[PDB]
Ligand binder design. Structure first.
Ligand SMILES: [Cd+2]
Ligand SMILES: [Cd+2]
Ligand SMILES: [Cd+2]
Length: 28
């Protein structure tokens, strides 16, 4: 159970989660 973009920038759609550490999706 990790974050969302640990191995999947899921912002392009809606796969992210309440743990966006990645830096390639302007989540909020
Ligand atoms: Cd991302
Ligand atoms: Cd994310
Ligand atoms: Cd995101």
């Amino acid at each position: 159970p990790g974050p969302c973009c640990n191995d999947k920038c899921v912002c392009q759609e809606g796969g992210c989660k309440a743990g966006c550490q990645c830096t390639s999706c302007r989540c909020s």
